[PDB]
Amino acid sequence: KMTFFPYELKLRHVFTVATYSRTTTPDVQVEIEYEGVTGYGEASMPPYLGETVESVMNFLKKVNLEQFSDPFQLEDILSYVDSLSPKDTAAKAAVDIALHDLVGKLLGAPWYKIWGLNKEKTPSTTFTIGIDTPDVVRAKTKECAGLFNILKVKLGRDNDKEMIETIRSVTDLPIAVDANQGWKDRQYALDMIHWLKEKGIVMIEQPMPKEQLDDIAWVTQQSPLPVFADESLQRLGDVAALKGAFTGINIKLMKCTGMREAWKMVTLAHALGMRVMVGCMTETSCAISAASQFSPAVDFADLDGNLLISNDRFKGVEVVNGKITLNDLPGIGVMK
Amino acid sequence: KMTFFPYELKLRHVFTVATYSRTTTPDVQVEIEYEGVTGYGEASMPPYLGETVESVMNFLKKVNLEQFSDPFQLEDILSYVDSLSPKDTAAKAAVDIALHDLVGKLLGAPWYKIWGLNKEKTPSTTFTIGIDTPDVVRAKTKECAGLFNILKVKLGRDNDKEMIETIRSVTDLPIAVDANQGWKDRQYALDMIHWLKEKGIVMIEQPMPKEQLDDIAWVTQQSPLPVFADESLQRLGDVAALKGAFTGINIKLMKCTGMREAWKMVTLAHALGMRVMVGCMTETSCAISAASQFSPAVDFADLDGNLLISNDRFKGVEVVNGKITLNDLPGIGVMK
Ligand SMILES: [Mg+2]
Ligand SMILES: [Mg+2]
């Protein structure tokens, strides 16, 4: 039995993505009950990604899980779920996450264990230093520069260099940058990458628009830093085409339809010699913990979504010594 | 605690591969015990594949699993096992199979369930009609045709057409052919595929030598039947290079190091738009059942290895209505 309801996330501070800022995030919480056991799922919908409370609720209303007598047949169930519409990946991810939580609970094990991973190999998660006045930047950098091992900075703006210089003036932590399709000029992108490398940046994400794949490959082939694809891909079927253009791929549950496809993407990327990183949207600990289950296999992780909201409903993965830390709870590892 | 010992397989009848006939098959049985639970593994060594009792025993003697306190860390354990030598894939597969059996038993579930597959989607397994005099061929065909839904014929000989005609004169069952790199001329191979198609053959396996991948792609691109690669690949790292040249790939545990890599190969092939089939060597029900755990994901299956030996040590997957049939036993699904 699947039930679901809207649960708007309240952000602690203004959150900015490219040219979009917000203080809330539409979200739908999902639950799947089977023989007294309940699996928790979630759909998070950053406005610019094209899904809404209406689209997600409408999609979930099309899903009939009652006709399935065995929660363990995830291949069949999720194939059916995917067939209900061409996209709606966040809505589909919510069903996938709840099903994995349910199945893990039925098996009495966390997915990192079912997948055969070593939880001690979880990565450090980045935490973002937001754009603001040089004084506010140095302040916030200092405030969190003590809990994390790596910092994230979103570039592609107008004061990128000043921002990096400001941050680097009060901390020596490595920095991961996400240009989010911000650099349209190929030479600028490469020149900036070399400058960032000199400033201690250790990874760059989506330097240019996804439409300029040839330019991206040109940059990556000469880049001293690993270049990860984000906006350039969404699902499993988008991975292969990026080989040779990117060093690795970024996987997000809300973009790929959940844990099952996410794990297939990790397998595919690796089998193809590409690296993998995992990201997130502003989410409750439900989706964050779910994604964390395969973090022992990634090179980089931006899994701080729940720290950005003031109304988390679950206690799941925690950040210890700046490291994503999985508990021993079965399923996706959360307690309501 | 891992223990192992030689267990030569006794074949029910002379078994031939190309021009090589034999009546026995070197094999090593493996057992991994953990807190009172035992996982069963197996390595099968057809002589022409490069491994021997000596090589397998010597490899296994190098494996130290006692240093690992958690059998669930398959990623780490099998990475370590693979690092011990360049090849020895059958010896490595034995460790992998025993570990999966153990983990499945500890979880209380069979791997087809852990992987999220529907056991009702298991395929029909082929059974081979051996090359012999027309009288023997007709007799042997009539004797087994009633138990199987599809028959296998090993072509690439000097009497291929007569063989197919002889068999087709007593049965209307679909036939899967394995040319075993027997056809050196792409034109001859293509014409043969067209001829076989009219004769009710539904699939072609390794039509030409692996050294002639260019000619193979030429034939496959204009073939009316799916063409599967066998000798053209061994492990996960060999799959991608076959895209566009083959319709699908054939996976065998003794060639790919076991279940974990096999499952990754299924993911990779499918993600790349390729089909998958699974095969086997003459083996006990241990290795046959292990491979059967992912059979619900394959298009074709040649999983009759245990039926060819007279000294099977386990009761596992069975053939019912010509279909591979998985039981509900945990791990790889066998009873000693
Ligand atoms: Mg990004
Ligand atoms: Mg073959």
Q: What is the CATH number of the domain that holds A319?
A: 3.20.20.120
Annotated binding-site ranges of A for Mg(2+): 178, 205, 230
Please state the separation of Cα A180 from the chain's center in Å: 14
Question: Measured between CA atoms, how close is B12 to chain A, in angstroms?
Answer: 38
Measured from the Cβ of residue A321, the count of other Cβ atoms closer than 10 Å reads: 9
Q: Looking at the structure, do residues B287 and B235 belong to the same domain, yes or no?
A: yes
User: Does the distance separating the beta carbons of B240 and A272 come in below 8 Å?
Assistant: yes
A301 C-alpha vs ligand 1 centroid, how far in Å? 11
Tokens read off for A125: 């998660």
**Which of A49, A108, A59 lies closest to A83, judged by CA?**
A59
Please state the separation of Cα A81 from the chain's center in Å: 21
CA dist B166 and A286 (Å) reads 63
**Which of A245, A239, A228 lies closest to A302, judged by CA?**
A228
Q: Looking at the structure, do residues A53 and A162 belong to the same domain, yes or no?
A: no
Q: Looking at the structure, do residues A140 and A101 belong to the same domain, yes or no?
A: no
Backbone angles phi, psi at A124, to 5 degrees: -80, 145
CA dist A24 and A11 (Å) reads 5
Q: Looking at the structure, do residues A134 and A104 belong to the same domain, yes or no?
A: no
Residues B210, B214, B215, CA angle at the centre, nearest 5°? Answer: 85
Contact partners, residue B260, CB within 8 Å, separation at least 6: A116, B74, B78, B96, B100
The angle that helices B89-107 and B259-271 make with each other, rounded to 10 degrees, is 90
Residues 219-248 of A with CB under 8 A from B: 236-237, 239-240
CA dist B329 and B335 (Å) reads 8
Q: How many CA atoms lie within 13 A of A186 on its CB side?
A: 13
Nearest-by-CA chain B residue for A120: B73
Q: Which long-range contacts (CB under 8 A, 24 or more apart) does B311-315 make?
A: B311/B9, B311/B10, B311/B284, B312/B284, B312/B285, B313/B7, B313/B29, B313/B284, B313/B285, B313/B286, B314/B40, B314/B284, B314/B285, B314/B286, B314/B289, B315/B285
CA dist B164 and B151 (Å) reads 11
Q: Are A282 and A11 in contact (CB under 8 A)?
A: yes
CA dist A65 and A83 (Å) reads 13
Alpha-helical regions (H) of chain B: 53-60, 74-83, 89-107, 111-114, 134-144, 160-168, 186-198, 213-221, 253-256, 259-271, 285-292
**Which of B19, B94, B154 lies closest to B283, judged by CA?**
B94
Q: Looking at the structure, do residues A196 and A74 belong to the same domain, yes or no?
A: no
Option in A114, A268, A296 nearest B114 (CB): A114
Q: How many CA atoms lie within 13 A of B42 on its CB side?
A: 30
CA dist A102 and A40 (Å) reads 7
Identity of the residue numbered B328: D
Alpha-helical regions (H) of chain A: 53-60, 74-83, 89-107, 111-114, 134-144, 160-168, 186-198, 213-220, 253-256, 259-271, 285-292
Report the 3 state secondary structure along B295-307.
HHHCCEECCCHHH
CA dihedral sign of residues B15, B18, B19, B24: negative
CA dist B82 and B62 (Å) reads 11
Breaks (C-N over 2.5 A) in chain B follow: none
The residue segments making up the domain with residue A212 are 109-336
Measured from the Cβ of residue B162, the count of other Cβ atoms closer than 10 Å reads: 12
CA dist B261 and B267 (Å) reads 10
Q: Last residue of a domain, which of B68, B91, B108?
A: B108
Tokens read off for B147: 């138990």
Contact partners, residue A214, CB within 8 Å, separation at least 6: A245
Q: Report the residue count for chain B.
A: 336
Option in B103, B109, B268 nearest A271 (CB): B268
Contact partners, residue A320, CB within 8 Å, separation at least 6: none
Tokens read off for A222: 């000469």
Q: Are B118 and B297 in contact (CB under 8 A)?
A: no
Alpha-helical regions (H) of A18-64: 53-60
Q: How many CA atoms lie within 13 A of B197 on its CB side?
A: 12
Sheet holding A275-278, edge to edge: A127-128, A151-154, A175-178, A201-205, A227-229, A248-251, A275-278, A300-301
Q: Last residue of a domain, which of A62, A84, A108?
A: A108
DSSP bridge pairs for A319: A324
Partner B contacted by A149 (CB < 8 A):
no
Annotated binding-site ranges of A for substrate: 22, 48, 152-154, 252, 280-282, 302-304
DSSP state of B211: G
Backbone angles phi, psi at A313, to 5 degrees: -105, -10
Q: Looking at the structure, do residues B200 and B132 belong to the same domain, yes or no?
A: yes
Q: Looking at the structure, do residues B81 and B118 belong to the same domain, yes or no?
A: no
| Burial readout B222-259 (b: 16 or more C-beta within 10 A, e: otherwise) | ebebbbbbbbbbbbbebbbebeebbbbbbbbbbbbbbb
Backbone angles phi, psi at A288, to 5 degrees: -65, -45
| Burial readout B268-279 (b: 16 or more C-beta within 10 A, e: otherwise) | bbbbbebbbbbb
Residue with structure tokens 């053959």? B201
Q: Looking at the structure, do residues A122 and A249 belong to the same domain, yes or no?
A: yes
CA dist B332 and B319 (Å) reads 16
Task: Report chain B residues whose CB lies below 8 A from the CB of A237.
Answer: 271
Q: Are A55 and A88 in contact (CB under 8 A)?
A: yes
Q: How many CA atoms lie within 13 A of A155 on its CB side?
A: 29
Q: Looking at the structure, do residues B51 and B159 belong to the same domain, yes or no?
A: no
Residue with structure tokens 């720290």? A307
Q: Last residue of a domain, which of B108, B128, B143?
A: B108
In angstroms, this model's resolution equals 1.6
CA dist B291 and B285 (Å) reads 10
B129 C-alpha vs ligand 2 centroid, how far in Å? 14
State the total domains in chain B: 2
Option in A108, A113, A267 nearest B264 (CB): A267
Question: DSSP per residue over A62-79, as a string?
Answer: T---TT-S-TT-HHHHHH
CA dist B163 and A116 (Å) reads 47
Q: Looking at the structure, do residues B200 and B286 belong to the same domain, yes or no?
A: yes
Q: Looking at the structure, do residues B28 and B129 belong to the same domain, yes or no?
A: no
CA dihedral sign of residues A56, B115, B253, B54: positive
Contact partners, residue B243, CB within 8 Å, separation at least 6: B272, B273, B274
Q: How many CA atoms lie within 13 A of B261 on its CB side?
A: 27
B133 C-alpha vs ligand 2 centroid, how far in Å? 23
Q: Looking at the structure, do residues A60 and A168 belong to the same domain, yes or no?
A: no
CA dist B253 and B292 (Å) reads 11
Contact partners, residue A253, CB within 8 Å, separation at least 6: A93, A96, A97, A259, A262, A280, A287, A290, A291
